[PDB]
Amino acid sequence: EVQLVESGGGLVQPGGSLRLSCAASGFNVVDFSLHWVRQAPGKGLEWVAYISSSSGSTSYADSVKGRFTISADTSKNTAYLQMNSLRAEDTAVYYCARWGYWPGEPWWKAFDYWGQGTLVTVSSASTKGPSVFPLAPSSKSTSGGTAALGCLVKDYFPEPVTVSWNSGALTSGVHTFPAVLQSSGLYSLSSVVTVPSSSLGTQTYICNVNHKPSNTKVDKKVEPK
Amino acid sequence: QVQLQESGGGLVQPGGSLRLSCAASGRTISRYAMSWFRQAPGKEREFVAVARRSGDGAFYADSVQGRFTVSRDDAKNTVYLQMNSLKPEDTAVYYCAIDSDTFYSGSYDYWGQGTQVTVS
Amino acid sequence: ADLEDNWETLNDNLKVIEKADNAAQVKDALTKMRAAALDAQKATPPKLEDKSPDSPEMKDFRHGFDILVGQIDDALKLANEGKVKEAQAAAEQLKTTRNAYIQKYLSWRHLVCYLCFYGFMAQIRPGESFITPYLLGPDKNFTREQVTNEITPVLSYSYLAVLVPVFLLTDYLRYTPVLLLQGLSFVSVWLLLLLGHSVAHMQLMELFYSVTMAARIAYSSYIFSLVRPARYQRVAGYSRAAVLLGVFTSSVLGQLLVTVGRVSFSTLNYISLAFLTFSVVLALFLKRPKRSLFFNVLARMLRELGDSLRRPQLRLWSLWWVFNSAGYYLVVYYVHILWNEVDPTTNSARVYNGAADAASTLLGAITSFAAGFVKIRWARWSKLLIAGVTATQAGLVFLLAHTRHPSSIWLCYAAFVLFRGSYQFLVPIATFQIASSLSKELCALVFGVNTFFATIVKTIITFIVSDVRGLGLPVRKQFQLYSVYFLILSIIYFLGAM
């Protein structure tokens, strides 16, 4: 089979330089042109740039014109997308896609074999430990049936962090929200479970976080006031 | 300044049929949403159905799925409700509701009057 | 939007790009070129429609559009680099490959131009306005009775006998052999006119001339069968302008040969025969279309016709069309006899029938240009306007009837010009008040039925009046009866008005 793979995406400063590598295992870039597609988290797909190793057609999009550059090599069968002086809009997933030349089966077939897609992020703040805060159900009023019990984590970087409830035992009713972009540049996230009021006073609830770059495991007990 | 009109109802049997209707006047409907609510003797402020836009379908409640049918006629600005064999545990008054948001988030300000519906 | 609209927007965009600089904004132009090239690939052309698709003779068409889209790619990849001079050479290469590859599966791209030259050149008949002075000159010298009560009655009966059978053959033969048969009919008319021996030869000449006066609808039907309905309006307008300009050029050329050039009438008909053989050659150089009117069903036509059976305005304009068309052809068939009656000058250059024909064609073109501009409500002021037009026609026929003066008939020539001002002023209005109610096939059917009833009325008046076994009346009492007839029509439409 023929397929694509992307590498090089990580954390950069706003205005830094980053070189993405798109490799095509199987086919060569002299018979098919390569393309880059941006997808912001929450937004939709949008085009960035392309390159054709047959002639050389480095024509870019109007939002990224004169700010990015691309260079493809057929001996290594790869494409380097070098990006300098970035902005905050480029926090996105970049897909490297194959698309053929005119005519016939290469061109009329669209972007058929999308790659795995690399992920780039733009943030002024570096990696730091998440601040974890409880969210108590306030069982003094509006009780009798069930309620909710949560953890609000904030001021962390990067995006992937996981929240476990009672070391992953209680998995029924767990809602973990996506990392919404805080206006201070950092990330914020909420997790919550549904707790019946009869089991609230007996079962002691803990709340642990697992963050892979920053070596921290904050396990806080959650309880009403 | 919008207003609603409705009709229908009657003492029906379990296994019969009924047609509720709601029309509106004051503002065009094809860029808004409409909804059907319920009020029982003893309870208050229940839900029946909702109709979003012109190119989409209706969305029902937890206990009326597969039993009711909600259409929408944008030419005469009339939303129907095909009651098909209502159980006698739903002897309640249905209300009509207009929306004041094009994103159908639930900006509800004006309702109807009511229609007496009782099964058996 | 199958092949020809994409071809037209591609030609227009290429003409834009050819005269444009500053290539930063030709990217929209080049991608519109690309869209017009890619949309016209699955088009299935009509010269290829008779052949089966996915054939090796179809691969040259797809390879031509392949190299077309490839050179559009070569243009736009050089236009995205900020260059302005490579796009012009790429457009020149695009022009050369468009002339070479695609034009093999395109038959003729001057179809509007060839129809304009056919309307401007093949309608030139300089002996048309001098038929009656040729029949009543020193060559053969037919008498007035033999040209009044014996030749044009055979023309009326022959117009009936070629309107009733030959209309189906006109609709059936896809209109290129119909125009070829019309050209052969012109050849037969001028060969019987140049080799006349008796009166029955001229009767056979009018028998062949009835086909020529009856096949005028076949030209517009050929336009509708060739030009698409998304192009029929403008091309039909330029073609009608070309036909009117060709008739005017024919009458002006007849005046330049007869009056100015002092060319004899036999040499005039020699020139007419030469230009009509040229018209036969141009009819041989036509293109046969496919989508005919009534052969390329009945229940849908009857269902759409049942809503237009007893309409009052449609019946009013239809009966007016029948009555005033019968009156128009009975004036035209005898007005040349009147012109040779009042002023029987034996000199060839002193015959000004062609100048009256040119002025009548010009005033008819003006009144046809000043017919569709009437933005007046037709509720109340319709029947009174019809009564006024018929009263004007009665006044002009009465002026033509009692004129026995050599110096006044000049103005009476202009009165016949004004007769076109009393006829062509309402012919586009009578077309607009019928065509805007039914489909175009039913429109042609209703105008055919109206021409049929006008031919019935003309045949009845010909059978009663000019027949020597019935009334047996000369042309002066015929014109007096025509003046009384238009006066009675004025009285009828005035009592219908108020």
Add this chain to the structure above:
Amino acid sequence: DIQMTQSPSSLSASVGDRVTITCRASQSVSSAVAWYQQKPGKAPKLLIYSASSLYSGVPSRFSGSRSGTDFTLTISSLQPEDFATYYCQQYLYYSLVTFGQGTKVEIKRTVAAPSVFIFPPSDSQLKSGTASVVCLLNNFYPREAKVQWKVDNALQSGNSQESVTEQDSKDSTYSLSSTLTLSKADYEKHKVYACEVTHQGLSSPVTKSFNR
């Protein structure tokens, strides 16, 4: 450069329902459009190419049609695998790739009332310097619910922060967590702190309040 609008941006159907996703172009684009199926988080896949053809690899329950500049994706029998985001992309030139907006389809689920629970923080954020209250909407449908955040009887807009979750694989319902982060100036306000939220399953917009 050009635009490519995609109208039914929020659809919903059950298992085995025919859906039609339309897409309108700006220019007179020829019959070369691309319909893509991207799972949430994963990579896109070519579903329909050239506006009519079926790709070798996608099942036979997918098709499309062209009407001028209006392209249409049609799904006859909606598999439960086929709940993803469908993207419309005209491909006319190499450098005119203009995607649509994405039509994230949903499961036809009965509209239930949102469980609306307000949560104040503990005494740790007042010793930290940044207060943050939240309002949770659990087990509701559809995604379109509007929180208003009535603080001191006023809709504090601009400082709110919403975050919807993906569709649950257990019961196909939604959760929202609106977060209001305020400074030390939240401390000296009045003794009422509420959030008002409205939803189609709610008759009246529910206002959840707390003190101190």
